[PDB]
Symmetry: C5
């Protein structure tokens, strides 16, 4: 049996699918299905059971057994970078994670969780998995950062696998529910299907991210499960590409449309990463040697799936 | 003693009536009577006691005894296909059901519950009670689907009856409270009694459902109780009929009126089943061999009862 | 010691007064004094103590002793016929009553409670205390009906007094707080003192009720306490009188005014009793043989007290 | 150690000051400081500790010790005569008081509490501390009345001091927070300092009250503590004076202004005491023989303190 | 291990930084991160863990251990002088503090907490740490005052360090979140960077405060920890300077701008301190002999850090 928190969300559901593809269906999904439209992400998948995040937490803290648990993929989190309720953020992200971590540690259950490249918080190089390089620009980022710091305290003493994946800009199938937190690829696709103009922020000529395909993210997750290695690892392609590149791949698929520039949103000024590029040294050194899909490859594959 | 959850609702109250007709009155109804107008559905019936769904759940989970329970007909659920609070849906439908199921299993109490053909989610044939054919279009459907999947895990090991009825489009007496979730028959009748025009969705020429009379649904329920067979079974006539057919039967009774087409509601686009027809192979194979009332028969009988 | 629930309400306060008149002042009143203006109903009376309905219930269910309890007059209920929250109605009326009943039963405390002729729900004769004749038109009525049904299950086995009084149209002193649930007598009086026209519903020419004076209701209550007889008994004059009769008695006292007809309120259409007349066969057979004040007598006595 | 509930309120804070003046500072104040502006009433005083009314109650009911308690002055209450939530009133005034009383009784702690002349409810003479003369005109008054009645049941059996002070119209320093429940003296003063006209109700020519200075009220309280006598005692000057008299004393101090008559407020019609005058027979008979400051004396002393 | 409550706030975060500078990183921060923007204050620091104030309190009161606690710096409080909810203020400031104090006392954990010069409440000299000189002008001040009074009762009997720092007008890095409670220095800086005019209250010519640099405040805190001395001590420079002086230092750095006078805000009239100057006699006598940065020094250092 495997547990996937955030299992009805974007990355989580993709981990579920990947597990299904390996013939594993004995999965417990933990999520918050308040936004019911998220069911789409599970409808075509095969799981054993579903539990709400709040119930799960209660049971975790009471020390309930869930049977023979092989791993927890902890993808569940408040994922909005524009959420400013720190109380909620620190409870739901940081505290929640701590609580899970301890539960796993005590039962020697492999624990594989989601960090974020938001922890790097705006810099132009050296995106390296170490405290010196970390300085989040928002409370979301802070909640992730502090957890990584917590994990770092625990690692030397741990008797079972602990892995944190520092995801960069993930995109692909099963993020339709993320609204304004959905990938630019997604937004452009839906704008184009609506006969609207595809929109980019003002200054996106100079904005670059490490855009990584969700399929690859899933593969990395399973690989680490199979291999047992511990640590905190960047997860991206290693190549930074401009938003313009993403737009290109998208318009190319749709055979139409032309980019329009909207004002840079006030609520992100000072909170924004203008450049990210994953340094994959540690990742490779851990033994994960598979290549990553480029924006051209990933976006077109995604576009096909969206239509 | 028999327990009927959703007992003040449409199908539940009809099960109560059917039990009354067999001389059984030692019934506990579990429901949520917040909408007080639902009392009409019980007023002319004979029951032993009434309990709110929330109290019932608490007692179930505490392992209270209710006396000598012969069966639970679990018809209680949030039945709105346009309810999008997934948290509520999964608690009140899925979790609730699990909780009941376990309670019954442990005491070897026959458990007969409501599934839904919404689990098939829009396809043009092969409405067969098996996972390959299931793909709900909304979270309501998902909550039903996942429970059936759960039941499927339990069945091989079960020591007492477990039956799920996959109801198609049920209509007849005691659904007045269902508002916009009430049968089209019901809506047309009340429109006509109000001197308004009888209304159908745009494109209903091509929309067909397996419309099944509530009386038959009740009979099936009791039959299964008496016969002890387990499984998940489609419950419909086996014949798909157009909404136009329903309208015909109705206008014929009222001796007046002409169909008006209203816009297809935005909130259902992408969430809608355009065709359903129950495959009754498993149902028949279980031994239930009685015929089902056609739309012509059922609707006219209903119309008489409404007036 | 005697307990009167609804003790600050109309009928309850009158039971208190009646007890006072017999030299009994060791009374605990249970009510919900949220509407503070209800204090008037107790101000001139003599009681031992006051408790809120919610606290009372908690203590009842915990099995607290209140000292040496001689009887509970259970007049407390949500008494509005236009309240449509069934959840609340069934908790506060039905469940609450059950809870009291059991408490009394276990301690062999005489339990005398309020039913309602609303249980008959609109019929033109045979207002007899038996299930065949009962069919309430609203959820208030349902909550009363179901409790009577519950009492009926308990009666054959009971070792102490259980009595339910099925009050018809009660009127008299101490109902000023009941707003639109107050007697027509009351409304007419206040309309006339305000220089307004006295108002009756459209079609009141054909509306008749068994109007019974509150003083008589109180007497019946005490009589049953003294005599120990069990059962469910109609409580009204046995004579149906038109609303016109009530108006006559009232205008006669005030020496002025002329009836005006207002529209029949939408919220009561289909929910309304057009005729009631208590069949006093069981009541008389139990041994209560005293006469009841007519509308002419009762209304004029009331009018004097109001001025 | 001494406890003063309502200690941050008008009368309570004055009791604190009086205790300070006798060299006693080991005081626990219990209040509800939601309206923070009430802190002024304590700022210049000396107390040992502060507790919220809700916490206090919890601890009382749990039977916590507070150390060596010498007395409780129970001045805490919802003091608004225009508050019509009876549920709250009866909990916070009546029930709360009962709870304290029992706590004290059990530990033989002298209990000195606040009643009110509102219990007399509008009469033109015989303001005597006995049930025949009591008939409050509002639920505030009722809550006080019923408690006095409760105390009366307890008194013959009590082994420690119980005293209730039936305050008439108290005025003086430390009532600035009472808003529209503040003394007329206070209102006139603030109207005059605002260059507005000093306002009296229409018909105040014929309205008289027993206006008593807060300083005297405090003295009475301490006297009873020192002397140990039990009972319920009127506390006022024994002389009724018109509102006009109060106005006179006030305008005289301010050397300006002329009375304006505003409409008698709707919300008080039928709820209003037109005359009060304390009968001090019992008070004197208990041994308290000190004189009371007249309106002329009291108001001018107050006016000086206000400026 | 060290605990810093209010650790994400202004003074608290500076204590954290100071601890970091001494090589201490084993810190638990307790705060309320509801306003997420406060994360900035911790982002560049090194702590062991984070806990919400409400959870912390629960655990404190349950008597949980946090490991080997060396000290608690209790800087956490509702710090707004214009918050008028006294209930909240007394719970969150006074009660909370008491609760911590007892926890520490019992485990002999050095307890170092924040008082306030607001306790002096407007006077023109003798700002001495003694009750005669204390008279707060608002409920915030009251909550601090009462706690100091409480500490004073405890001190003679205490077996471990208790220190309260009566901070005057603190200013410097990490107060950006304090909005209108932020230093005038801060406000002027942000006004100037916005091309607006730097604003001072009307009458600031005659307003002087003891402005003290946050760096010094931090030093004092650590010094007391190292030295073990107990008591309540003023913490300011000992020199009063006008707001004009602060403005001067600021405009001098920015090389531009001219002071504009805005109306004195209504909500502060009667609640305002016009003059403060710390008397450092006790502070020096305790042994703390280091000098304090003047407004000229402090403000310019701050201005550099802000830019
Ligand atoms: N998407 C990216 O590009 C990316 C990049 C870097 C990091 N990440 C991180 O990776 C994880 C997955 O991201 P995502 O894109 O899949 O986000 P997502 O689509 O929103 O998936 C997360 C789901 O988990 C729920 N959730 C929140 N807190 C939970 C908890 N404590 N336990 C269980 N479920 C919880 C969310 O709902 P509610 O918040 O409404 O309760 C949501 O349904 C998140 O931690 C995210 O921060 C993602
Ligand atoms: N009528 C159809 O065409 C049809 C078709 C397929 C399936 N079904 C299913 O068969 C059952 C009967 O449906 P229906 O048409 O009779 O709907 P319904 O009239 O609304 O009956 C359900 C009643 O039970 C209540 N309820 C909800 N959750 C409950 C719970 N956990 N325990 C007990 N009662 C609960 C509902 O109120 P609240 O949610 O507001 O609390 C309602 O009063 C439902 O499960 C429904 O999904 C019906
Ligand atoms: N007067 C009539 O024409 C007549 C006729 C037939 C039957 N009855 C019945 O006689 C009883 C009293 O009637 P009434 O006219 O005297 O009504 P009433 O004036 O409204 O008095 C009832 C009082 O009891 C309170 N209450 C509600 N639930 C309670 C509970 N569980 N325990 C204790 N008190 C509770 C009510 O407040 P809240 O509900 O707001 O909390 C109200 O203050 C009711 O059951 C009523 O249905 C009266
Ligand atoms: N001064 C008069 O004219 C006068 C005349 C006759 C009788 N009295 C009585 O004398 C007492 C004090 O009167 P006052 O004029 O000083 O009124 P006050 O200034 O309003 O004093 C009462 C204070 O106690 C608080 N409180 C309420 N319930 C409490 C409780 N259960 N325990 C502790 N504190 C509580 C009140 O706030 P909240 O209600 O907002 O919670 C308020 O702060 C009251 O019982 C009053 O009814 C006064
Ligand atoms: N800054 C000055 O010139 C000066 C002057 C006078 C007094 N002080 C005192 O110094 C202390 C801190 O000052 P500051 O300038 O750093 O103010 P601050 O920035 O507001 O720091 C206090 C922080 O702690 C939080 N908090 C509130 N109650 C808490 C509790 N019980 N436990 C833990 N955290 C809590 C506050 O949030 P929430 O209130 O929203 O919950 C806030 O984030 C306060 O006690 C303050 O009164 C400083
Ligand atoms: N440039 C541009 N253009 C257009 N659009 C856009 C851009 N950018 C961005 N965008 C959008 O918005 C949003 C926000 O952004 P940000 O702030 O940057 O965030 P991001 O990163 O991008 O995303 C996020 O992330 C995170 C982590 O990292 C996660 O968790 C989440 O979920 C998300 O993904 C965005 O979203 C877009 O749409
Ligand atoms: N075509 C047409 N026309 C008209 N009308 C209509 C149509 N369709 C539909 N409709 C209406 O609306 C509503 C909704 O529907 P739906 O979404 O589709 O749903 P249904 O299926 O129909 O019904 C339902 O079902 C279910 C299952 O199956 C149940 O549960 C519920 O309750 C219901 O019944 C309807 O209702 C109509 O009215
Ligand atoms: N005819 C006429 N006119 C005028 N007014 C009136 C009439 N009728 C009636 N009314 C009024 O409204 C109300 C209501 O109605 P119902 O629903 O029917 O109610 P009833 O029965 O009469 O009364 C009631 O009752 C009950 C039981 O039986 C109780 O619980 C309640 O509380 C009441 O009493 C009436 O009220 C009148 O005012
Ligand atoms: N005459 C006159 N003029 C003017 N103003 C007035 C008068 N009277 C009165 N006022 C006013 O209003 C108020 C209230 O009144 P009442 O309702 O009457 O009340 P009193 O008695 O006066 O006072 C009260 O008391 C009580 C006890 O008894 C207490 O608790 C409260 O708090 C109060 O004090 C008055 O105040 C004035 O302003
Ligand atoms: N003379 C002044 N000129 C401009 N702003 C002021 C002045 N005095 C106070 N303020 C602003 O108003 C706020 C509140 O002041 P006050 O209530 O005296 O608290 P404090 O003593 O903490 O400054 C301060 O944080 C500051 O931003």
């Amino acid at each position: 049996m495997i547990i996937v928190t955030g299992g009805a969300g974007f990355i989580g559901s993709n981990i579920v699918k990947a597990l299904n593809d390996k013939g594993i269906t004995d999965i417990l999904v933990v999520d918050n299905l308040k936004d019911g439209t998220k069911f789409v992400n599970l409808v075509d998948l095969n799981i054993a059971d579903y539990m709400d995040k709040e119930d799960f937490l209660i049971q975790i803290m009471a020390g309930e057994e869930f049977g023979d648990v092989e791993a927890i993929f902890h993808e569940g989190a408040c994922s909005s970078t524009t959420e400013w309720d720190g109380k909620y953020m620190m409870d739901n992200n940081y505290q929640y994670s701590k609580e899970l971590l301890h539960y796993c540690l005590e039962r020697e259950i492999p624990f594989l969780y989601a960090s974020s490249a938001a922890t790097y918080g705006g810099r132009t190089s050296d995106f390296i998995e170490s405290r010196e390089y970390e300085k989040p620009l928002n409370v979301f980022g802070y909640s992730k950062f502090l957890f990584d710091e917590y994990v770092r305290q625990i690692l030397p003493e741990a008797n079972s696998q602990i892995v944190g994946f520092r995801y960069f800009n993930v995109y692909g199938p099963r993020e339709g529910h993320k609204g304004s937190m959905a990938s630019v690829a997604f937004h452009l696709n839906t704008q184009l299907n609506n006969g609207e103009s595809p929109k980019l922020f003002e200054g996106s000529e100079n904005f670059k991210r490490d855009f990584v395909y969700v399929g690859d993210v899933a593969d990395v997750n399973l690989w680490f499960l199979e291999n047992g290695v511990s640590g905190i690892f960047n997860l991206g392609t290693g190549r930074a590409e401009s938003f313009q590149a993403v737009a290109d791949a998208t318009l190319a698929y749709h055979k139409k449309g032309q980019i329009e520039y909207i004002p840079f949103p006030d609520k992100l000024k000072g909170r924004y990463q203008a450049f990210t590029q994953a340094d994959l040294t540690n990742l490779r050194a851990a033994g994960y040697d598979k290549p990553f899909k480029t924006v051209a490859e990933g976006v077109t594959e995604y576009m096909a799936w969206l239509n």
